[PDB]
Short mmCIF file of C-alpha atoms in Angstrom, two decimals:
data_model
loop_
_atom_site.label_atom_id
_atom_site.label_comp_id
_atom_site.label_asym_id
_atom_site.label_seq_id
_atom_site.Cartn_x
_atom_site.Cartn_y
_atom_site.Cartn_z
CA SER A 77 291.76 121.98 200.01
CA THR A 78 287.98 122.23 199.97
CA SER A 79 286.49 125.17 199.29
CA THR A 80 283.48 126.60 201.58
CA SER A 81 281.13 126.43 198.75
CA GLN A 82 282.15 122.95 197.73
CA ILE A 83 280.89 121.98 201.20
CA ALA A 84 277.55 123.34 200.70
CA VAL A 85 277.06 121.19 197.48
CA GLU A 86 278.72 117.64 198.38
CA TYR A 87 278.65 117.39 201.92
CA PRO A 88 275.89 115.52 203.89
CA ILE A 89 273.52 117.58 205.92
CA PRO A 90 273.77 117.20 209.75
CA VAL A 91 270.56 116.66 211.67
CA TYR A 92 270.61 118.93 214.73
CA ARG A 93 269.91 122.28 213.18
CA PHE A 94 266.05 122.54 212.00
CA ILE A 95 262.77 124.44 212.10
CA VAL A 96 259.66 123.08 212.95
CA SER A 97 256.27 125.08 211.83
CA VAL A 98 252.88 123.85 213.27
CA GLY A 99 250.34 125.64 211.01
CA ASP A 100 250.65 129.45 211.07
CA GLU A 101 252.97 129.27 214.12
CA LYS A 102 256.43 128.27 214.26
CA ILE A 103 257.79 126.81 217.64
CA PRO A 104 261.21 125.34 218.78
CA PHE A 105 261.20 121.68 219.11
CA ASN A 106 263.83 119.59 220.91
CA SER A 107 263.45 116.32 218.65
CA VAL A 108 261.04 115.23 215.89
CA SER A 109 260.75 111.13 215.00
CA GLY A 110 258.91 109.02 213.06
CA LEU A 111 257.80 110.91 209.76
CA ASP A 112 258.34 107.86 207.19
CA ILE A 113 256.66 106.68 204.33
CA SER A 114 255.54 102.78 204.26
CA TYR A 115 253.37 100.22 202.15
CA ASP A 116 251.94 97.08 202.48
CA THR A 117 252.85 94.75 200.06
CA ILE A 118 250.48 92.44 197.86
CA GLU A 119 251.54 89.00 196.78
CA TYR A 120 250.17 87.04 194.16
CA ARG A 121 251.02 83.53 193.42
CA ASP A 122 249.68 80.87 191.06
CA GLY A 123 250.62 77.29 190.28
CA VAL A 124 252.71 77.61 187.02
CA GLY A 125 255.53 79.45 189.07
CA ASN A 126 255.10 83.22 188.62
CA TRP A 127 254.91 85.45 191.66
CA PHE A 128 253.59 88.78 191.43
CA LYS A 129 254.83 91.20 194.02
CA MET A 130 253.08 94.79 194.16
CA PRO A 131 252.89 97.88 196.02
CA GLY A 132 249.80 97.98 198.03
CA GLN A 133 247.83 100.04 200.62
CA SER A 134 249.63 102.93 202.13
CA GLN A 135 250.14 103.18 205.96
CA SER A 136 248.92 105.89 208.21
CA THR A 137 251.94 108.55 209.13
CA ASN A 138 252.47 108.72 212.88
CA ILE A 139 255.01 111.45 213.98
CA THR A 140 256.37 112.43 217.70
CA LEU A 141 257.55 115.80 218.59
CA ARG A 142 259.38 116.49 221.57
CA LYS A 143 259.62 120.00 223.41
CA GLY A 144 260.51 121.29 227.04
CA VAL A 145 258.18 122.95 229.31
CA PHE A 146 258.37 126.69 229.23
CA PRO A 147 256.77 128.86 231.99
CA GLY A 148 254.37 130.85 229.87
CA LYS A 149 253.41 128.69 227.11
CA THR A 150 251.17 125.66 226.58
CA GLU A 151 250.11 125.85 223.04
CA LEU A 152 251.01 121.89 222.50
CA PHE A 153 248.28 121.57 225.33
CA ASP A 154 245.80 123.94 223.91
CA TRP A 155 245.65 122.08 220.83
CA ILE A 156 244.88 118.36 222.23
CA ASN A 157 242.64 120.20 224.85
CA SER A 158 240.25 121.42 222.03
CA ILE A 159 239.24 117.82 220.71
CA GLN A 160 235.72 117.72 220.89
CA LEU A 161 234.12 114.70 219.73
CA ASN A 162 235.71 114.20 216.16
CA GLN A 163 236.22 117.74 215.81
CA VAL A 164 239.77 119.10 216.11
CA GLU A 165 241.71 121.58 213.88
CA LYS A 166 243.99 119.65 211.69
CA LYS A 167 247.26 121.83 210.58
CA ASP A 168 250.43 121.35 208.47
CA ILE A 169 253.67 120.79 210.24
CA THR A 170 256.98 121.50 208.20
CA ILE A 171 260.07 120.30 208.95
CA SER A 172 263.23 121.87 207.56
CA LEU A 173 267.03 121.39 207.86
CA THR A 174 268.70 124.77 207.93
CA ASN A 175 271.97 126.42 208.37
CA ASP A 176 273.41 128.13 211.31
CA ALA A 177 270.96 131.04 212.32
CA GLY A 178 268.76 129.75 209.46
CA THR A 179 268.11 132.02 206.71
CA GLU A 180 268.39 129.19 204.24
CA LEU A 181 266.64 125.96 204.07
CA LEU A 182 268.55 122.58 202.91
CA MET A 183 265.80 120.27 203.07
CA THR A 184 262.15 120.31 203.56
CA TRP A 185 259.60 117.69 204.89
CA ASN A 186 256.00 118.53 204.75
CA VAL A 187 253.02 116.76 206.73
CA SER A 188 249.31 117.24 205.63
CA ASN A 189 246.24 117.30 208.26
CA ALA A 190 248.02 116.60 211.29
CA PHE A 191 246.09 116.09 214.55
CA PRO A 192 247.32 115.19 217.95
CA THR A 193 246.75 112.12 220.19
CA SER A 194 248.72 111.40 223.30
CA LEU A 195 250.17 114.55 224.71
CA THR A 196 252.69 113.01 227.28
CA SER A 197 253.53 115.03 230.51
CA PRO A 198 256.87 115.19 232.25
CA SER A 199 258.09 112.57 234.56
CA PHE A 200 258.30 114.40 237.96
CA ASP A 201 261.52 113.24 239.77
CA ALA A 202 263.12 114.50 242.95
CA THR A 203 266.47 113.15 241.85
CA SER A 204 266.78 114.15 238.26
CA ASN A 205 268.80 116.75 236.77
CA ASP A 206 266.69 117.25 233.66
CA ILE A 207 264.36 119.60 232.14
CA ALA A 208 260.63 118.88 231.84
CA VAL A 209 259.74 117.89 228.49
CA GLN A 210 256.61 116.90 226.58
CA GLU A 211 256.25 114.69 223.72
CA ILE A 212 253.00 115.13 221.17
CA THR A 213 252.14 112.48 219.04
CA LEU A 214 250.64 113.42 215.49
CA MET A 215 248.56 111.25 213.18
CA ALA A 216 248.79 112.60 209.63
CA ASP A 217 249.18 111.65 206.10
CA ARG A 218 251.32 112.39 203.05
CA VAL A 219 254.88 113.06 204.12
CA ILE A 220 256.35 114.63 200.96
CA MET A 221 260.42 115.56 200.96
CA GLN A 222 261.22 118.80 198.81
CA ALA A 223 264.46 119.72 197.71
CA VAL A 224 265.82 123.13 199.29
CA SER B 221 274.65 138.94 230.54
CA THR B 222 271.07 137.32 231.34
CA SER B 223 269.34 139.17 233.62
CA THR B 224 267.57 137.00 236.73
CA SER B 225 264.00 137.84 235.52
CA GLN B 226 264.70 137.16 231.97
CA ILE B 227 265.37 133.51 232.95
CA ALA B 228 262.05 133.42 234.92
CA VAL B 229 260.46 134.01 231.56
CA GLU B 230 262.75 132.19 229.00
CA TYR B 231 264.03 129.65 230.39
CA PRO B 232 262.72 125.82 230.72
CA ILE B 233 261.54 124.61 233.85
CA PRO B 234 263.55 121.57 235.98
CA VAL B 235 261.39 118.88 237.23
CA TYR B 236 262.79 118.25 240.53
CA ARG B 237 261.06 120.62 242.49
CA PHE B 238 257.21 119.91 242.78
CA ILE B 239 254.30 119.90 245.14
CA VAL B 240 251.96 116.82 245.15
CA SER B 241 248.62 117.75 246.95
CA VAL B 242 246.09 114.65 247.21
CA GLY B 243 242.74 115.92 248.27
CA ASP B 244 242.88 118.42 251.43
CA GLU B 245 246.27 116.56 252.19
CA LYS B 246 249.46 117.97 250.67
CA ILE B 247 252.00 115.22 251.03
CA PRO B 248 255.71 115.18 249.97
CA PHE B 249 256.27 112.57 247.05
CA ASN B 250 259.82 111.08 245.80
CA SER B 251 258.35 110.77 241.99
CA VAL B 252 255.19 111.16 239.93
CA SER B 253 254.99 109.32 236.56
CA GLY B 254 252.19 108.76 234.05
CA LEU B 255 249.66 111.41 233.75
CA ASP B 256 249.36 111.67 230.14
CA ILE B 257 246.37 112.50 227.76
CA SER B 258 245.75 109.97 224.97
CA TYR B 259 243.22 109.33 222.33
CA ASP B 260 242.07 106.33 220.07
CA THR B 261 242.04 107.12 216.35
CA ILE B 262 239.12 106.34 214.01
CA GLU B 263 239.93 105.62 210.70
CA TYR B 264 237.31 105.49 207.58
CA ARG B 265 238.36 104.49 204.35
CA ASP B 266 236.31 104.06 201.27
CA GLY B 267 236.57 102.86 197.67
CA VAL B 268 237.09 106.43 195.96
CA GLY B 269 240.29 106.91 197.45
CA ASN B 270 239.65 109.28 200.58
CA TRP B 271 240.87 108.34 203.87
CA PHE B 272 239.32 110.10 206.95
CA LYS B 273 241.40 110.05 210.37
CA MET B 274 239.47 111.24 213.41
CA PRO B 275 240.31 111.61 216.94
CA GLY B 276 238.36 108.77 218.82
CA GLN B 277 237.33 107.68 222.43
CA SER B 278 239.95 108.99 225.30
CA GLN B 279 241.86 106.77 227.38
CA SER B 280 241.83 106.24 231.05
CA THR B 281 244.32 108.02 232.77
CA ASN B 282 246.72 105.92 235.02
CA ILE B 283 249.35 107.78 237.42
CA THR B 284 251.86 106.37 239.52
CA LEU B 285 253.19 108.09 242.54
CA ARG B 286 256.11 107.01 244.53
CA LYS B 287 257.03 108.09 248.32
CA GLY B 288 259.52 106.63 250.89
CA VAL B 289 258.11 104.91 254.20
CA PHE B 290 258.18 107.20 257.09
CA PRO B 291 257.80 105.85 260.89
CA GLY B 292 254.59 107.31 261.83
CA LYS B 293 252.72 107.68 258.81
CA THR B 294 250.69 105.52 256.33
CA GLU B 295 248.19 107.71 254.91
CA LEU B 296 248.70 106.21 251.28
CA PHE B 297 247.90 102.79 252.60
CA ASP B 298 244.75 103.91 254.71
CA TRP B 299 243.27 105.36 251.53
CA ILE B 300 243.62 101.96 249.56
CA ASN B 301 242.65 99.86 252.50
CA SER B 302 239.23 101.88 252.82
CA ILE B 303 237.83 100.19 249.49
CA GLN B 304 234.61 98.27 250.21
CA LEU B 305 233.13 96.99 247.56
CA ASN B 306 232.95 99.72 244.91
CA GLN B 307 232.67 102.47 247.25
CA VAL B 308 235.86 104.27 247.71
CA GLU B 309 236.70 108.17 248.56
CA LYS B 310 237.96 109.68 245.22
CA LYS B 311 239.92 112.98 245.59
CA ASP B 312 241.76 115.36 243.14
CA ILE B 313 245.48 115.46 242.91
CA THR B 314 247.67 118.42 241.83
CA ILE B 315 250.96 118.57 240.77
CA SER B 316 252.57 121.79 240.44
CA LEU B 317 256.42 122.83 239.48
CA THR B 318 257.64 125.35 241.82
CA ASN B 319 260.58 127.34 242.61
CA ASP B 320 262.86 126.86 245.24
CA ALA B 321 261.15 126.88 248.72
CA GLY B 322 257.94 127.20 246.85
CA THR B 323 255.83 130.18 247.38
CA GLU B 324 255.24 130.58 243.70
CA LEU B 325 253.95 127.78 241.34
CA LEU B 326 255.32 127.74 237.65
CA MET B 327 253.00 125.09 235.84
CA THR B 328 249.98 123.11 237.45
CA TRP B 329 248.57 119.88 236.43
CA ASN B 330 245.15 118.77 237.85
CA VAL B 331 243.77 115.14 237.99
CA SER B 332 240.15 114.60 238.88
CA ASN B 333 238.27 111.59 240.71
CA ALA B 334 241.48 109.60 241.37
CA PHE B 335 241.29 106.37 243.41
CA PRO B 336 243.99 103.97 244.26
CA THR B 337 244.65 100.59 242.85
CA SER B 338 247.88 98.57 243.57
CA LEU B 339 249.81 99.90 246.72
CA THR B 340 253.40 98.19 246.12
CA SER B 341 255.06 97.38 249.61
CA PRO B 342 258.88 97.98 249.92
CA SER B 343 261.15 95.01 248.83
CA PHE B 344 263.07 94.31 251.81
CA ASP B 345 266.56 93.16 251.07
CA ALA B 346 269.36 92.59 253.63
CA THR B 347 272.07 93.55 251.22
CA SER B 348 270.84 96.99 250.05
CA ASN B 349 271.58 100.48 250.97
CA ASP B 350 268.19 101.92 249.99
CA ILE B 351 265.34 103.41 251.80
CA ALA B 352 261.89 101.66 252.22
CA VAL B 353 259.63 103.19 249.10
CA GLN B 354 256.09 102.56 248.26
CA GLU B 355 254.53 103.08 244.91
CA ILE B 356 250.73 103.74 244.72
CA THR B 357 248.93 103.74 241.51
CA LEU B 358 245.95 105.92 240.72
CA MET B 359 243.36 105.65 237.99
CA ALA B 360 241.41 108.67 237.29
CA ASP B 361 240.32 111.29 234.19
CA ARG B 362 240.96 114.57 233.07
CA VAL B 363 244.43 115.46 233.23
CA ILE B 364 244.39 119.11 232.50
CA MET B 365 247.52 121.31 232.48
CA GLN B 366 247.41 125.12 233.76
CA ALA B 367 249.54 127.92 233.44
CA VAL B 368 250.70 129.26 236.39
CA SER C 243 272.07 119.97 264.24
CA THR C 244 269.50 117.16 264.35
CA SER C 245 268.96 115.54 267.41
CA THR C 246 268.93 111.63 267.67
CA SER C 247 265.14 111.51 268.73
CA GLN C 248 264.43 113.73 265.59
CA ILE C 249 265.76 111.22 263.34
CA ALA C 250 263.49 108.67 264.95
CA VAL C 251 260.53 110.69 263.76
CA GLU C 252 261.47 112.53 260.66
CA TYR C 253 263.57 110.28 258.87
CA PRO C 254 262.65 107.47 256.15
CA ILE C 255 263.41 103.57 257.12
CA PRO C 256 266.08 101.54 255.63
CA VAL C 257 264.84 98.18 254.34
CA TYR C 258 267.85 95.92 255.32
CA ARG C 259 266.93 95.58 258.85
CA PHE C 260 263.79 93.37 259.27
CA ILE C 261 262.25 90.41 261.22
CA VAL C 262 260.43 87.72 259.30
CA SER C 263 258.14 85.23 261.33
CA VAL C 264 256.50 82.31 259.83
CA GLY C 265 253.75 81.30 262.11
CA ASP C 266 255.11 80.48 265.67
CA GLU C 267 258.73 80.43 264.12
CA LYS C 268 260.86 83.29 263.53
CA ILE C 269 263.63 82.46 260.81
CA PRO C 270 266.49 84.74 259.39
CA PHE C 271 265.66 85.51 255.67
CA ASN C 272 267.90 87.24 253.19
CA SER C 273 265.15 89.08 251.37
CA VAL C 274 261.17 89.47 251.09
CA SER C 275 259.62 90.60 247.87
CA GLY C 276 256.12 91.23 246.30
CA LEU C 277 253.61 91.60 249.18
CA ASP C 278 251.54 94.05 247.40
CA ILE C 279 248.01 95.08 247.06
CA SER C 280 246.17 95.26 243.92
CA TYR C 281 242.68 95.71 242.30
CA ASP C 282 241.10 95.07 238.95
CA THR C 283 239.24 98.10 237.81
CA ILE C 284 235.66 97.97 236.51
CA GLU C 285 234.40 100.55 233.73
CA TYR C 286 231.03 101.39 232.85
CA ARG C 287 230.62 103.99 229.94
CA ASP C 288 227.18 104.66 228.66
CA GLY C 289 226.13 106.79 225.52
CA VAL C 290 225.39 110.13 227.21
CA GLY C 291 228.93 110.43 227.90
CA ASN C 292 229.81 109.79 231.61
CA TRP C 293 232.43 107.23 232.40
CA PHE C 294 232.27 105.19 235.90
CA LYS C 295 235.48 103.81 237.15
CA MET C 296 235.17 101.48 240.15
CA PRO C 297 237.32 99.45 242.10
CA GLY C 298 236.79 95.74 241.58
CA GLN C 299 237.67 92.28 242.46
CA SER C 300 240.84 92.11 244.72
CA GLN C 301 243.93 90.06 243.52
CA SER C 302 245.90 87.29 244.79
CA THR C 303 248.98 88.15 246.99
CA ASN C 304 252.09 86.34 245.93
CA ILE C 305 255.25 86.54 248.19
CA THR C 306 258.67 85.53 247.55
CA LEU C 307 260.93 84.73 250.58
CA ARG C 308 264.78 84.04 249.93
CA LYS C 309 266.98 82.47 252.31
CA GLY C 310 270.59 80.89 252.49
CA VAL C 311 270.87 77.02 253.07
CA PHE C 312 272.06 76.12 256.34
CA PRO C 313 273.76 72.76 257.36
CA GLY C 314 271.42 71.38 259.93
CA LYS C 315 267.96 73.12 259.25
CA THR C 316 265.41 72.38 256.10
CA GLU C 317 262.32 73.85 257.56
CA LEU C 318 260.95 75.66 254.43
CA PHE C 319 261.54 72.46 252.75
CA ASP C 320 259.44 70.39 255.20
CA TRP C 321 256.64 72.98 255.05
CA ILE C 322 256.27 72.40 251.28
CA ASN C 323 256.94 68.79 251.62
CA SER C 324 253.83 68.31 253.84
CA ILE C 325 251.33 68.83 251.08
CA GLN C 326 248.80 66.20 250.55
CA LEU C 327 246.05 66.49 247.92
CA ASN C 328 244.66 70.02 248.96
CA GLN C 329 245.67 70.00 252.49
CA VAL C 330 248.52 71.94 253.83
CA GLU C 331 249.07 74.09 257.22
CA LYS C 332 248.61 77.47 256.38
CA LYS C 333 250.12 80.32 258.54
CA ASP C 334 250.69 83.70 259.21
CA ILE C 335 253.79 85.77 258.08
CA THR C 336 254.78 89.11 259.45
CA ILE C 337 257.51 91.22 258.31
CA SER C 338 258.87 94.03 260.44
CA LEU C 339 261.38 96.69 259.95
CA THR C 340 263.21 96.91 263.02
CA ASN C 341 266.39 99.08 264.58
CA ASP C 342 269.88 97.77 265.18
CA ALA C 343 269.94 94.63 267.44
CA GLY C 344 265.78 94.62 267.08
CA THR C 345 264.10 95.45 270.34
CA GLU C 346 261.71 97.91 268.55
CA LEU C 347 259.78 97.80 265.65
CA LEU C 348 259.21 100.52 263.37
CA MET C 349 256.90 99.44 260.64
CA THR C 350 254.94 95.68 260.30
CA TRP C 351 253.18 93.98 257.47
CA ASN C 352 250.73 91.11 258.16
CA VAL C 353 250.00 88.01 255.75
CA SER C 354 247.05 85.71 256.31
CA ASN C 355 246.60 82.03 255.36
CA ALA C 356 250.13 81.87 253.59
CA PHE C 357 250.94 78.48 252.00
CA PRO C 358 253.95 77.49 249.85
CA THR C 359 254.30 76.97 246.33
CA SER C 360 257.41 76.48 244.21
CA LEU C 361 260.24 76.06 246.54
CA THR C 362 263.58 76.73 244.39
CA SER C 363 266.79 74.74 244.93
CA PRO C 364 270.21 76.35 244.67
CA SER C 365 271.88 76.24 241.39
CA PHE C 366 275.03 74.28 242.18
CA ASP C 367 277.80 75.96 239.91
CA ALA C 368 281.63 75.15 240.16
CA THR C 369 282.90 78.57 239.20
CA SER C 370 280.77 80.56 241.68
CA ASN C 371 281.74 82.21 244.84
CA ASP C 372 278.27 82.32 246.34
CA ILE C 373 275.92 80.69 249.04
CA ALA C 374 273.48 78.24 248.37
CA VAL C 375 270.19 80.29 248.30
CA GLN C 376 266.68 79.06 248.31
CA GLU C 377 263.33 80.99 247.34
CA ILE C 378 260.32 79.93 248.52
CA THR C 379 256.88 81.30 247.27
CA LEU C 380 253.57 81.87 249.08
CA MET C 381 250.31 82.53 247.99
CA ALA C 382 248.03 84.51 250.38
CA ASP C 383 245.77 86.92 251.11
CA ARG C 384 245.32 90.30 253.08
CA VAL C 385 248.33 91.88 253.22
CA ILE C 386 247.80 94.80 255.95
CA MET C 387 250.53 97.38 256.91
CA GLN C 388 250.70 98.34 260.57
CA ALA C 389 252.18 101.58 262.27
CA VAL C 390 254.88 100.29 264.73
CA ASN D 255 210.39 87.26 182.11
CA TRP D 256 211.28 87.27 185.63
CA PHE D 257 209.57 89.64 188.08
CA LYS D 258 211.04 90.69 191.43
CA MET D 259 208.95 92.94 194.07
CA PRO D 260 209.38 94.24 197.23
CA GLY D 261 206.77 92.67 199.43
CA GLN D 262 205.64 92.44 202.89
CA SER D 263 207.33 94.39 205.54
CA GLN D 264 209.01 92.65 208.45
CA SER D 265 208.58 93.33 212.30
CA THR D 266 211.27 95.45 213.78
CA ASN D 267 213.03 93.83 216.92
CA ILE D 268 215.20 96.23 218.92
CA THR D 269 217.76 95.25 221.75
CA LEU D 270 218.71 97.99 224.16
CA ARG D 271 221.30 97.23 226.73
CA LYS D 272 221.85 98.89 230.08
CA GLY D 273 223.70 98.70 233.42
CA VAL D 274 221.86 97.90 237.00
CA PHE D 275 221.62 101.09 239.05
CA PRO D 276 220.94 100.76 242.82
CA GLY D 277 217.77 103.07 243.06
CA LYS D 278 216.32 102.62 239.73
CA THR D 279 214.32 99.81 237.86
CA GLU D 280 212.16 101.51 235.28
CA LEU D 281 213.16 99.18 232.70
CA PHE D 282 211.66 96.20 234.72
CA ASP D 283 208.49 98.21 235.80
CA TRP D 284 207.38 98.38 232.00
CA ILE D 285 207.84 94.95 231.37
CA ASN D 286 206.23 94.13 234.46
CA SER D 287 203.12 96.10 233.56
CA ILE D 288 201.86 93.54 230.86
CA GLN D 289 198.58 92.53 231.62
CA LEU D 290 196.97 90.00 229.24
CA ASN D 291 197.70 91.78 226.04
CA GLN D 292 197.58 95.52 227.16
CA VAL D 293 200.76 97.20 227.65
CA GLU D 294 201.83 101.05 227.34
CA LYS D 295 203.61 101.18 224.13
CA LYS D 296 205.88 104.10 223.60
CA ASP D 297 208.30 105.80 221.22
CA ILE D 298 211.78 105.10 221.26
CA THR D 299 214.26 107.90 219.83
CA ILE D 300 218.09 107.19 219.29
CA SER D 301 220.15 110.12 218.17
CA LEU D 302 223.91 110.20 217.28
CA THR D 303 225.10 113.75 219.24
CA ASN D 304 228.48 115.64 219.78
#
């Protein structure tokens, strides 16, 4: 006999309900991938036997967002088309696990200074029953995870 | 109760209905692959701690078009046969997602200066129930995606 | 209501009916593989921004013909056995998609100066229900595709 | 006491690399015009752009 407010505190969070917000816009995405912290390890070892292991230089964060092609809207493409030589508008991406008809966040990830590389066009295919989907890849720094 | 003009605005576009047009000709293709933007990333990192990430040098676009073998027609082969030393006729390829019996485009991709490398002959096979298909591979620049 | 002479003009060609002819001989083969054109690409790129892509040096053609072992006949082996130091008899191979009981060719590929490397013996196997098959591999130049 | 000073400057040597184009040899015509010690010297500007 678990109460419905006990499940909100004790139970794990399902992945499939999430909100992605790219800058000021919020746009519906099919899937989000990557988005993990990582560290190189520095190892010193000298002759008397002691072995030092340290966290080292952080690694660059690479995120992949996947989204279907909608008939009026290309604002994933216009972001990657605006790249002149090294100047692009970087913007913050927030992923947020929500409840059904999300008025309440459960977890929140924050990405800083994300800019697009490698927008992937759909694979046109005459014998396929799929939607035209696009992956955009983002390079960024500082994934942080926020409670609620 | 979704109206049929609401589906034209809100719903994603299926991949299987598309028009490929190679230069002045338009020819029916079985599948189109590749056709994506990409960028190298330049990373500067100095001693005080700040880490600069930039979009860098663009990558060359490589497209693969697949097409069955028809009895009178070899005009994918005659394009790749006309390569003398470095001189080939480059032409523009446009992919375009359409409706049923296409009188109306929904999305459009444009490829500039595409020229053929690596025409692939069918694999003759006495125990196979397939059509003779051919892949041609194109190297090009500047994929752009146009709305409608 | 498609007429039977309309199918001869409009419909794609199935792969499984083909004639292979090695030199003056014609011999029945189980499958033919490889047999594709390819080109290296030369890329020039200078400082003002323009990027030249060219077709470059052609690649060598490598074909793989597969054939079952018949009790009286080894004339795939006698071709590869005749290799003295660099002297082998090169001969032209033609593949040709035909109709049923072939009196009429639909497509034709032509290979020039093909000579054998790497004849593959069957894998004898006491728990297998297969025919003894052999692959011969051919290195050649100039695949051309002829209409009819 | 040990004195260290900047001294005599060194001569500048630059290497420019360029592909061969079918109509144009004006890198060659510059170096072909060398008679005994007389050559036309000219100013080279490199400029990083957008």
